[PDB]
């Protein structure tokens, strides 16, 4: 559907506003100010006013790299390089200059295994001498060069092969953030992840700096005096959490100006509330249904599809996929803010979506019933569950915590799986808390005692999904490994995919193979919404709005 993307307040702004922002999350703030050491959407957003985890590049509304931001980037096809130019007046919040080594240090904080980051990808191996650096065969990155020294403002990255997503943000073939080397160099690489200098007392490049950080709660942003861009209108921004149960109570209380990331089900409650304008955009988002099909070997950085389970059979994967009544749930609870997904690529990447692709958006109990009958799983008319060759078809469902419907939705899906002869049960007879879910799935090697789970994402701003599902990917929580899906992922970023007609097809095949193989079953695409208080001026969700934090302001007390 169609909302406003920007709240267009004609009331001009005051000198010194005290904005009060919040993000919905029932888990403590996992505050990490180094992009390469963080893997959490709540803090990606909360790091905004402080330069969104120190990102360099401005972009257009379609995430294509534009000039004007902290740095420019100049791609060249003949050279097979990206020349990255730091602004001369780009400094850290303590007043130190941002220079060549700080950018390069970001590559070290991911590529060097000593820091314990999860964000390396085969995509980074495309950079010259970087893979050898990662494995420890070379003590420097030969591809990354400093045309005017470490204190200079230019970095030159030589690639092996150019890639079509390099013109767009989130591509993962080169990095877009800096780390303050001087401030951090003397902290032990292994200690960096949990250091106060990268959690509670960081240095930043953005328009505001974190004066104080209450761990697992809040940040107090004040204007960063050493910012290159415009002088912000606001005096101080407070960015907090903000649980799901207390969100509406907080809006009715007029406690927050902005609340980002509210669940779709609270929208019917929030619409009625006056004193707020509700904006909305196409969320860069996907929800999934994971099947545990193996583990991740970190020693060799590789997905191994070795877990013993009926979900190793293609039909069972599909059948369980076809059973779910997502459409029902989304209508009953999600107020037209979540649409069942037909594939892994969300509509925001409209070029590469297509209604020729059918997925699991339509409930098809009858086809699922067949699919199971055709794989030797016969229904036991006594119990109404399918038995094959001795063993009863039963699976463990690691459902997560969510809104007030969370509990009802999970039990609803059991019924549906019961309807096709599968016996599903909740993990440890209870819904799973998020942070513990994260640990259970994201920590290697992988849990042994769950069959099904759900998993949401704030996707990268480039449609390619190599970081999520590639063989070497640690974010492949199902842990499948399929040479055909490896070929699809690769063909999308091939030299032939510079021609967008070709890549359009490579993305389709990927989506059709990924639905047919059914290693992961797509659940929902989603439209964002943010309630902005009527006193706020200059607010917008527009992607390509590059100065929102500078231009935003208030006008007295909240409505």
């Amino acid at each position: 559907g169609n909302f406003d993307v920007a709240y267009q307040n004609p009331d001009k702004a005051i000198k010194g506003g005290n904005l009060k922002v919040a993000y919905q999350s029932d888990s403590p703030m996992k505050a990490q100010w180094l992009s390469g050491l963080s893997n959490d959407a709540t803090f990606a957003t909360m790091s905004g006013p402080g330069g969104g985890q120190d990102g360099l590049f401005f972009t257009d509304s379609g995430f294509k790299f534009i000039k004007g931001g902290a740095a420019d980037v100049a791609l060249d096809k003949e050279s097979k390089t990206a020349t990255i130019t730091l602004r001369k007046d780009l400094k850290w919040s303590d007043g130190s200059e941002v220079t060549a080594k700080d950018y390069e240090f970001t590559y070290e904080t991911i590529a060097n295994p000593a820091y314990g980051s999860d964000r390396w990808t085969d995509s980074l191996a495309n950079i010259v001498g970087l893979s050898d650096y990662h494995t420890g065969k070379a003590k420097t990155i030969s591809g990354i060069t400093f045309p005017d020294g470490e204190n200079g403002k230019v970095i030159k990255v030589q690639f092996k092969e150019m890639k079509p997503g390099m013109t767009q943000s989130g591509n993962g073939y080169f990095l877009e953030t800096v780390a303050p080397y001087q401030y951090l160099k003397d902290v032990a690489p292994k200690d960096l992840a949990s250091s106060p200098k990268t959690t509670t007392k960081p240095l930043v490049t953005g328009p505001f700096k974190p004066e104080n950080v209450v761990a697992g709660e809040s940040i107090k942003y004040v204007p960063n005096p050493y910012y290159w861009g415009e002088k912000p209108k606001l005096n101080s921004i407070t960015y907090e959490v903000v649980s799901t149960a207390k969100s509406v109570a907080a809006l009715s209380s007029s406690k927050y100006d902005i609340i980002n990331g509210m669940v779709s089900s609270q929208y019917k409650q929030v619409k009625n509330l006056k004193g707020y304008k509700v904006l909305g955009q196409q969320a860069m988002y996907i929800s999934l249904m994971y099947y545990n099909l193996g583990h991740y070997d970190a020693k060799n950085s590789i997905n191994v599809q070795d877990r013993k389970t009926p979900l190793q059979d293609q039909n069972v994967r599909q059948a369980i996929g076809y059973a779910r009544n997502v459409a029902e749930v989304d209508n009953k609870f999600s107020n037209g803010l979540s649409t069942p997904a037909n594939s892994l690529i969300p509509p925001i990447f409209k070029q590469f979506t297509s209604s020729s692709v059918k997925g699991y958006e339509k409930q098809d109990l009858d086809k699922a019933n067949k699919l199971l009958d055709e794989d030797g799983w016969k229904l036991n008319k006594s119990t109404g569950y399918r038995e094959k060759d001795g063993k009863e078809l039963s699976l463990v469902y690691a459902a997560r915590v969510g809104d007030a419907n969370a509990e009802t939705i999970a039990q609803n899906y059991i019924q549906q799986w019961k309807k096709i002869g599968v016996k599903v049960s909740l993990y440890n007879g209870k819904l799973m808390e998020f942070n513990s879910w994260v640990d259970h799935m994201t920590t290697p090697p992988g849990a042994n005692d769950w069959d099904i789970t759900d998993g949401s994402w704030s996707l990268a701003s480039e449609p390619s999904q190599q970081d999520l599902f590639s063989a070497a990917a640690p974010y492949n929580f199902g842990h499948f490994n399929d040479s055909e899906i490896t070929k699809d992922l690769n063909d999308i970023d091939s030299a032939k995919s510079e021609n967008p007609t070709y890549r359009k097809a490579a993305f389709v095949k990927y989506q059709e193979d990924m639905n047919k193989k059914a290693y992961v079953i797509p659940t929902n695409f989603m439209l964002n919404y943010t309630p902005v208080n009527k006193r706020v001026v200059g607010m917008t969700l527009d992607y390509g709005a590059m100065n929102t934090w500078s231009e935003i302001g208030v006008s007295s007390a909240k409505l």
């Binding site: 919905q24 893997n39 959490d40 959407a41 988002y285 998020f434 949401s456 701003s461």
Partner: peptide, 9 residues
């Protein structure tokens, strides 16, 4: 942007 885990569904 970059790929990030969400609490949503």
């Amino acid at each position: 942007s970059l790929s990030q885990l969400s609490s949503q569904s």
